[PDB]
């Protein structure tokens, strides 16, 4: 029966390949050949946020576009005021290897998690003025690789146990489990309407999940190696994906196919983080080298370079109003670019 | 803008308090050495962690053990509660002082898997500069297997037939030459992997140890002392 089921799966894969080929008529590059190049976009390091002891592993902007959260594997979550470079908060973590941090859209809470397989939710607006662990979500059997606040009560966390999970923070219970990934889920990206989210894993495939249902809507298998980064397009109808194969790829949810591949012959290092600008014209991706390349997302041209990190760029985030880009690296430094 | 100035001053005061706490944390963080316990889960790591604790654990997530040798603090982390895929969560240990690699030397069947794991650790992009303290554990079991002769290494390692014990080998008293040759061949496999690449940026410190061996803390202390001596010499341009 195993042979028959495998043959049926192969037939279904061939069928979806044929459907995608039939729907694929033009090419994004062919269509955008008439679009003028975005030019040499060069950004300046307008802030350097220093104070972390160990490598910065994660980053997240606040909705106000001014407050930042950074996670460092020394066991710290630092809330920075990016405008005035001050440190708003410094939260010591029970486990040092925190691989992900999240900022609640309301700014009341901050999430973190890592090798302890636990998502720690910290209340930033306690009455006494301190930061307390408001919740300790457990239930993942692998390391917490990503977490994104759906709201103050719901959080989506991706884990190294090849599963994602929608948690109700008030009850501390895993309300929904998203399964289907074969490798460790390394990245997670909520849609702008938060009805869907895409997760990239180590099986070289990304999956679109319905939050309210728990079923995987679609799977995208363009990459060749582990997916480390993933970001929704501002429209919400597409997303970019960075992998260890030194390429980024754009997948459209409705087209259900690769639209563009952003890669260069001289870059042979994996992509650690990806992000889009406000209009989505620019795709910012940090690499295992000391650099973050910004790409014309419609033209696949490397528009510019952000250099200035001593070690590999670990985290990358474009602020909500698009004024700046925060890149955190393994040299314990976080830089704002504008 | 008096209120704005007051808010700015309050933010500066909070940042100054946070920076003072961060300097204290930097002192504590740099004063202590982080060790990553690696090796097959079937033999060695848990017993070594328990021995350090006798000299503090935790099933949920990583098993952490803090011990102190002389006046120096070592924090050893056995990464349990994780899936069998090591390639992603191990990049987070790129800055540890040392990786303590425990090998069941008596298990010839799993010796090649241990060698492959050691090669992956040695040649990993983010572990290129990390030294490995190699604990060839279960030396009593290895001696028992060699003396009994039920299973021979030449069955699993054909090059053992042509192997001769090194001239610098230091057999323990009452140790037959066969056990010494087998032990040093098993050590020399890892040492060959270690010396095949590295460019001198990291070193492998092999030790023959057992369960009843209480010297492991001193061995780790001495090896970390040499690791940081090499780091200083590279930093001091003395190399």
């Amino acid at each position, epitope marked *: 029966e195993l042979d028959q089921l495998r043959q049926e799966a192969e037939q279904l894969k061939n069928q979806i390949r044929d459907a995608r080929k039939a729907c694929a008529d033009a090419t994004l590059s062919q269509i955008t050949n008439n679009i003028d190049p975005v030019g040499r976009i060069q950004m300046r390091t307008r802030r350097t946020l220093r104070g972390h002891l160990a490598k910065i592993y994660a980053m997240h902007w606040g909705t106000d576009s001014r407050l930042l959260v950074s996670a460092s594997q020394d066991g710290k979550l630092i809330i920075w005021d990016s405008y005035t470079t001050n440190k708003v908060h410094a939260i010591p973590l029970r486990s040092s290897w925190v691989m992900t941090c999240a900022y609640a859209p309301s700014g009341n809470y901050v999430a973190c998690g890592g090798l302890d397989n636990i998502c720690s939710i910290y209340n930033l607006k306690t009455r006494e003025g301190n930061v307390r662990v408001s919740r300790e979500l457990a239930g993942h059997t692998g390391y917490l690789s990503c977490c994104r606040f759906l709201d103050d009560n719901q959080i989506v966390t991706s884990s190294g146990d090849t599963t994602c999970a929608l948690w109700d923070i008030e009850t501390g219970q895993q309300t929904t489990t998203f399964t289907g990934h074969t490798g460790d889920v390394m990245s997670l990206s909520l849609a702008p309407d938060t009805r869907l989210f895409v997760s990239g894993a180590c099986d070289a495939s990304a999956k679109l999940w319905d939050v309210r249902e728990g079923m995987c809507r679609q799977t995208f298998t363009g990459h060749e190696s582990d997916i480390n980064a993933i970001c929704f397009f501002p429209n919400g109808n597409a997303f970019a994906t960075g992998s260890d194969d030194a390429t980024c790829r754009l997948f459209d949810l409705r087209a259900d196919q690769e639209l563009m591949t952003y890669s260069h012959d001289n870059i042979i290092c994996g992509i650690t983080s990806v992000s889009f600008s406000k209009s989505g014209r620019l795709l910012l991706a940090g690499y295992d080298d000391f650099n973050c390349n910004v790409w014309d997302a419609l033209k696949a041209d490397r528009a510019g370079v952000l250099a200035g990190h001593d070690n590999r760029v670990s985290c990358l985030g474009v602020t909500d109003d698009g004024m700046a880009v925060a890149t955190g690296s393994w040299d314990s430094f976080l830089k704002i670019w504008n | 803008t008096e209120d704005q100035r007051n808010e700015e001053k309050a933010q500066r005061e909070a940042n100054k308090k946070i920076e003072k706490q961060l300097q204290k944390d930097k002192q504590v963080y740099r004063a202590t050495h982080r060790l990553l316990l690696l090796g097959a889960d079937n033999s060695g790591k848990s017993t070594i962690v328990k021995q350090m604790r006798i000299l503090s654990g935790g099933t949920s997530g990583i098993f952490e053990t803090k011990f102190q040798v002389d006046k120096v603090n070592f924090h050893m982390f056995d990464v349990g509660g994780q899936r069998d895929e090591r390639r992603k969560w191990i990049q987070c240990f790129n800055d540890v002082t040392a990786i303590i690699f425990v090998v069941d030397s008596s298990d010839y069947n799993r010796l*090649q898997e241990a060698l*492959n794991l050691f090669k992956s650790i040695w040649n990993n992009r983010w572990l290129r500069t990390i030294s490995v303290i190699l604990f060839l554990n279960k030396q009593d079991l290895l001696a028992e297997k060699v003396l009994a002769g039920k299973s021979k290494i030449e069955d699993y390692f054909p090059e053992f037939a042509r192997y001769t014990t090194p001239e610098d080998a230091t057999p323990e008293p009452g140790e037959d030459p066969r056990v010494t040759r087998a032990k040093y061949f098993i050590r020399d496999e890892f040492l060959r992997i270690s010396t095949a690449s590295g460019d001198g940026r990291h070193y492998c410190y092999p030790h023959f140890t057992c369960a009843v061996d209480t010297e492991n803390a001193r061995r780790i202390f001495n090896d970390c002392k040499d690791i940081i001596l090499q780091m200083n010499l590279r930093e001091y341009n003395l190399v």
Partner: nanobody
Framework: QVQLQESGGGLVQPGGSLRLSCAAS????????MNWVRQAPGKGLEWVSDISQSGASISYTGSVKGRFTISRDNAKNTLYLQMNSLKPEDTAVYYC?????????????????????RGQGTQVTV
């Protein structure tokens, strides 16, 4: 879509020679280190051999290193394992595994349990 399809296997008398092949797709295959891995009945996945990107730096496990020569055809995008002398202990499912990242000397394949860039395997009974 990364795919590794293994062919060759079946019943072979002891002392026989068998050429396992693996067709690779979904990746360049000229910039990846390739491996042959083995799962004996009731034993678990065990690494057999590996070959570097350029085809040099071949290495074998001790139980087969006098045989089981590994080869790689980047032009044909295939991997080969020629098992010249075969033993009853070689009866196992042979998988072709790809190292997770292209330009790396490390080979962090998760042999046991599930590995993404591994084939479905071919059964070899001796």
């Amino acid at each position: 879509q990364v795919q590794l399809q293994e062919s060759g296997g079946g019943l072979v008398q002891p002392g026989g020679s068998l050429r396992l092949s693996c067709a690779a797709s979904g990746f360049t295959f000229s910039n990846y280190k390739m491996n042959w891995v083995r799962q004996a009945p009731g034993k678990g996945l065990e690494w057999v051999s590996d070959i570097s990107q350029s085809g040099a730096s071949i290495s074998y496990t001790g139980s087969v290193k006098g045989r089981f020569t590994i080869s790689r055809d980047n032009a044909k995008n295939t991997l080969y394992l020629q098992m010249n002398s075969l033993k009853p202990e070689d009866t196992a499912v042979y998988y072709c595994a790809r190292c997770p990242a292209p330009f790396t000397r490390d080979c962090f394949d998760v042999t046991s349990t599930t590995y993404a860039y591994r084939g479905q395997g071919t059964q070899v009974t001796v």
